[PDB]
Amino acid sequence: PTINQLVRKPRKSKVEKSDSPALNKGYNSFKKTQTNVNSPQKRGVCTRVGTMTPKKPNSALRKYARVRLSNLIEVTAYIPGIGHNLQEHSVVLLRGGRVKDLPGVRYHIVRGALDTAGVNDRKQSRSKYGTKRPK
Amino acid sequence: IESAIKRVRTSANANAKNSSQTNAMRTAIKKFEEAVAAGADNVDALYNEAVKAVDMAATKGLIHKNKANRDKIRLSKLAK
């Protein structure tokens, strides 16, 4: 471009965006608007717990939960690990991160936080999946 | 609440006195203006009474000295 062009219209950068828009918003019941807040984790209520079939190179029953967030955005997350204490209406805590198998799951569920029971008999990579030491 | 009651009372009394004295000043001045409109020879003494009230209001914290000066100057231009 010519410098005249670059003054008549400047370089307008490639607009960016997040891999987790649901975490980057909030809600005040008074004015009832999306409040933009950069929150690492959130709370939600599992509105469904089920299984899904992953993409073609893989084959499995991937455990998901559809969840109703504090900010009233409904979100599909993954239940990592082996086993869960979850049901519909079960309070849950959510963190970010894709699950490359299904597309519609941009989020993960956290273990050891709330009604989510810690994983059972997991001794390695233990902070992850949230289960206390075997003494 | 916190010892502001006394300042409420004293400020109201001050309001009374200060508004009274300003009204006195303004009545003197208006009287002089009407005298200058009526052309009576009392203008000479009413001028002095108006100046008197203006400066006595510059005293006692009613009137800033610049406002007093502007009033005296306006009255002077009316008389002379």
Next chain:
Amino acid sequence: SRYTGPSWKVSRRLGISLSGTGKELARRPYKPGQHGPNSRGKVSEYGMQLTEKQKLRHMYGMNERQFRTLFIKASKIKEGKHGVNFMVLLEQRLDNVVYRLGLATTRRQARQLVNHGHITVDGKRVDIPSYHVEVGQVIGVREKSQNISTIKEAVEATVGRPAFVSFDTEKLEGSFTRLPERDELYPEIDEALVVEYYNQ
């Protein structure tokens, strides 16, 4: 944090005698673990860099952040060579001063003397093994602690000391007499690899 673990294990991973003795490599000069003696495969340049860095911090019992900050403070200097100044600043640590003066057999022993407070600088107690030392100071064993038999054994079992030091046995005081030198340090290390490592 401080390392309470084995010495020889570290030394024989790295493939070098840190104590200058040999028995931390003698009879088993291969990395630990049941994949130790068998045919190690190729290794990478990142591996070499990391190994050089780990040699130094395992010598001096140091932490990564201390190491990094000391590297930065050496970088702030312009009057010399970068990694050589880094090694000198490592040498100016009471852990190593006590060792080079022959006042203790190991850097762990030396650190323990320093921290337990058996040592002085210009006649003042110091429980800080990371204490920097300028050329000209006077390290000195605590005059009450000169009676321990451990240090007397360690001092009368002294091989010929380095060139950059001065020391007396009756006084149990010594000091640096030089910057000190580079080549008088362990030439087994390639400081350029640390430089490339932390240039990243």
Next chain:
Amino acid sequence: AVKIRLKRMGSKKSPFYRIVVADSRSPRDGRFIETVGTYNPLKDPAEVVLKEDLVLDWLSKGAQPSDTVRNILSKEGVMKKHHEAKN
């Protein structure tokens, strides 16, 4: 009122002070016009640094120190010089 006082610096349980020319309306640490020295009692005696010319100029221009600053300026001989210059 314009004043010549001292503002707080240094860590807790290890104080230090800068003598400073401050209105009484400003905070303990805030607006100031000029610094004219500093102070700490953490030595065995007290220890002081001063700028005689500027502090005497502000005293002439109408300053009004605090009690401890008056003590310090007495020890440093500034109040006496101001008195003399007024005589």
Next chain:
RNA sequence: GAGAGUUUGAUCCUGGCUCAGGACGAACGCUGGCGGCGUGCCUAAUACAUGCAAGUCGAACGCUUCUUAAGAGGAGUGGCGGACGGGUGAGUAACACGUGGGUAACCUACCCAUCAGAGGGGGAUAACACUUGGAAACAGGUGCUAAUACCGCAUAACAGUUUAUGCCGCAUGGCAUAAGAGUGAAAGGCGCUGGUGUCGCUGAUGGAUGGACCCGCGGUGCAUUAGCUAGUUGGUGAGGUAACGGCUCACCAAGGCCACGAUGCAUAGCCGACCUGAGAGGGUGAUCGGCCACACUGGGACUGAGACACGGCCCAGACUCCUACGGGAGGCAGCAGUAGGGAAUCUUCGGCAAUGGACGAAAGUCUGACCGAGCAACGCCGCGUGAGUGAAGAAGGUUUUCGGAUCGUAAAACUCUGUUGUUAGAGAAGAACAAGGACGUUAGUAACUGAACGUCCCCUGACGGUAUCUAACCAGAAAGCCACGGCUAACUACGUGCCAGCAGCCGCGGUAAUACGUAGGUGGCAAGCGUUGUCCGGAUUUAUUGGGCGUAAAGCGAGCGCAGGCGGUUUCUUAAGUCUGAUGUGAAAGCCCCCGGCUCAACCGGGGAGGGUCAUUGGAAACU
């Protein structure tokens, strides 16, 4: 100014995705010894239970209660302060902020310096005593009373104004002198012996201090927002403000702003600074400091030097509270704290000893400012969790080619230590003071008290019997987190069998998985580790530095031309751009350099350096 992986059967381009690093006011998970320093509602400017945050003066004044006329306490009037301090950042896209300037259009209690003066009088009012108001806060009525309260009388204008000159400036105009006309001030207390000194009182100036206004320039997105304004633009008058002016009213005219982005919409406190980056730049505006704005929402004034006032008044509205149901009262975005929201961020603590502020002659009273302590591994720094000797190498775990290998000098064992921990003793600085008891010097004195200045005596610590130091004792009470297919440092066994599950990207798993899970082992960090989320970089992936358009993305289908952008050679001229000297400012804190103190370090302090498409003046002019 380091790159790596990933499209393919493979190769090179193009092009995107991800990773390698640094930083959080961080949160979650697992674990968890100590010390130092700092930070801690980013969300609901949501609502506030409770407690405390602004009082002070008896040497301004008169009462009342207790003191054998002394001092002390209650409510009065009056003065000063309450406008600072403290909190928050909602609104605000504009002189709000920053920077540079201007005010011959200005104001300023307290503090300094100077010229002067402080005279004589008057009428009340609270309080208090009775009265009604009845739950009583309230409130009204009659009477008495003091003041540095109030009133007006006496004089000065040195204030301001007009005339006459002079002088100067940037037009309006400003400074010096003289004159004219008219106006206005007050307060006494304490002490000494009418004279007084001290604190206060009134006028004028000057300074300082802070404040008010005005201008250049600058800093955010949309044109799927192109027109906007009508007291709007200007003028003649008048009014008005501390002051300029449409600030306001009338009258006269129809002008004024904008494609250099007006208007509108959305968003937002701005800055010093902070994080990152080779830099250019980007992102943020937490803690500390500065300017602004707000105080349940909206409006308006009074008082006062100063407010259109967080803890003041009136009114309207919303919201709540106590009532004896007649009527009242309130406003935590002050410090703690509650509920709620939330992923989530503190004790309903001590003291004014310090430092600072109000008041006071002073002691001193007040001070949720501030000093400190407390909770939180939230962060940065430091030390630990023992050290030496100890073998072809205990058992046991794992593996095995069943010979052995590794956990492993690791252990047991013997020697030593006590950072730390437990116990017992000693026990700092931070404190300077002020007042008071004494002396001495100055200039004011008719003279002494007294003021200013100096030198001694005197007494003052919440933290805290904490830091710190000494001695006795125990290795004893003190290490975990993640990863190990490649990018990436780190490998085997068993179970499982496209299931369970892993996964930042490539992708692993379908009976022999270094990718799942466990065990062993190793590697990277370490009282932390890992993970998410956010910002920068790598990303030259918005390319000014620093990219491209034949086929990958892209040359409008093509032309005519307003505006703008650019423009042949050359003399003279200017000096807007440009270059350049000096001067000023760019606060402090912070980054950086040199120093110095905290057992080093973090941190703290001193000094310096630098920082502006900055401003005034003064030159060149080659180039535009």
